[PDB]
Ligand binder design. Sequence first.
Ligand SMILES: Oc1c([C@@H](Nc2ccccn2)c2ccco2)cc(Cl)c2cccnc12
Ligand SMILES: Oc1c([C@@H](Nc2ccccn2)c2ccco2)cc(Cl)c2cccnc12
Lengths: 264, 270
Amino acid sequence: DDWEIPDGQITVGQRIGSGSFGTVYKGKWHGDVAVKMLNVTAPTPQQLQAFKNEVGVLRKTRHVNILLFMGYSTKPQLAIVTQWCEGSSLYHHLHIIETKFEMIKLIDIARQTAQGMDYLHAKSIIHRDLKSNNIFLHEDLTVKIGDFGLATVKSSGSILWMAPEVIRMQDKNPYSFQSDVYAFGIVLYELMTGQLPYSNINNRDQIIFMVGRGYLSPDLSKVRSNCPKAMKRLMAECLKKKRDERPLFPQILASIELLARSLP
Amino acid sequence: DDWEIPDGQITVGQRIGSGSFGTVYKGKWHGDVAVKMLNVTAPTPQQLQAFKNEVGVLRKTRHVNILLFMGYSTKPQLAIVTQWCEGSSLYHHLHIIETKFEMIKLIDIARQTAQGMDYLHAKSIIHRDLKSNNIFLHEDLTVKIGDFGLATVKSRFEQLSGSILWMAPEVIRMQDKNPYSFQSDVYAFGIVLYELMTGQLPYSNINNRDQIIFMVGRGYLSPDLSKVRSNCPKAMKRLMAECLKKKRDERPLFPQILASIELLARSLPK
Ligand SMILES: Oc1c([C@@H](Nc2ccccn2)c2ccco2)cc(Cl)c2cccnc12
Ligand SMILES: Oc1c([C@@H](Nc2ccccn2)c2ccco2)cc(Cl)c2cccnc12
């Protein structure tokens, strides 16, 4: 019952990026895989902690909509190995290559994402950084939620997806299922409008300040016409400035399924 | 945090099928899933064992070409929950609806299956029932090796008698100690490569189950390789023949089979 990969079996290749801790690479281990390593040979103290935290969460997940954790290593360097997703992140599709998804496909992507979130929450896992860039469209179909570590289970910037309470830090622990729900709301906004929120404001600090005070919020009137009213309503629900008024995924999921069933 | 699903969360629907090791369904648990249950009112001691053994093997797997194990339940009834595959099995594509896959695709299905087998064997897991019926073509793109009811971790039964087309001669004779090995899995893989390249099941012109069993076992009968498609790469027809060797110890292991398929793939027509 061990997920530790034997020493020196992982072949590392092209450098991809650098999420959470360390650097991510496309590598080899019983096929293509993603490898999140640590450049230093001296794992330091709190680096060996963020490492054990991620593995600890990742290893509690087995769901088609959650990036597949395959194993970890301490080999020469600490390394988390996950499946290799073929394609691009939803963020890249929507805002870089501006892919034109049909409404059916957009509804389905929101569904799978919620499917995935519902699962994480059932396991008492709070993502804490859900955003269109951590949502991968594997093989152009099938959502894979990724990048954890920053994720916890039970007791740069990504402000666009941060709920008002999170921005305020009036608890130092404003994170909860509800704040995950809010970010999903911002993700819904992207799919449904094809754009990032507040694109007409060029000052981040202003954006941060105003969302936190409840003065600014996503402009829902921007939703595409062919967007089902029930979706636009689900969206507003998730984006409630007041935490406790937001619905939970079991509910989100039911709503998205009923609007999807009656769409064609 | 075990993989034991909390009680009363799994719902079951369509009865996709039956079997000696339980019947399959298309239930739900955080999205669609495949639920394998046990109809009986009280599991016999051997069933409880088959259940445990499968879960023990399944929970050791995390690979894109292995059907995803999600959890099990015992309280309501013994149940194994796996991801629900969208599409059909390679068997159905190949022999029931005759799907016209391109050689590039066939080589690909052959590669992924090998990739999966390579993964199981590295963890000392012997499938023991690899066949096109248990190879799901998820979304018509991803190969998912399933049905782990007879699987076992080396150094850890008397079942099966239905799918003889994929049984190696030494498995039919049951002479040797440990009839099953990484090699018998490789033989089954060989019959699958055979199915992929010919589009047909072996021994289609013989209709007597017993005679086929006896003959393949005695070595009088073997897969007719002259039937392999003409556009089938030579190295492949060779790799196939090697996996089908009558002498167990002459068959290559998946790491080498994997290396070969990947090699003959890089030099394929354009
Ligand atoms: O492609 C991958 C990325 C990249 N995400 C996206 C998202 C949209 C389009 C293109 N890439 C990325 C890397 C670094 C920073 O972002 C990140 C990780 Cl962890 C992967 C893990 C396994 C397979 N593929 C992965
Ligand atoms: O569909 C599934 C089957 C059935 N196989 C096929 C093959 C071709 C077309 C349709 N179904 C089946 C039924 C009975 C005994 O095996 C078996 C498993 Cl393990 C599955 C696991 C996840 C998703 N789907 C699965």
